[PDB]
Amino acid sequence: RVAIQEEITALNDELNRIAETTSFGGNKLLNGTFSTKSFQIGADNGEAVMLTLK
């Protein structure tokens, strides 16, 4: 059970590494600092869609 726990902890640290390091040109996505960002899709101002990354 301890031997299995070793790979559980290695994989759990793997999830936290994915969350903290995944980025789009340095803009971290999966660690929760992205929050909600609005993407302007339209020829006039005020037409944007809210993307939420958790």
Add this chain to the structure above:
Amino acid sequence: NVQSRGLDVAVRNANDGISIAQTAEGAMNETTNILQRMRDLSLQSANGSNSKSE
């Protein structure tokens, strides 16, 4: 004779006013082109993909 000479000056003055109105419009042609570029940049900058750097 006085009206004919005066009318010749009148065409000269009408042409000069056309010259000033033409030059002013030509300059405002580039003012429109610059403002349109500023509008494209603003729309590009309103996206949430950009971080502060861009």
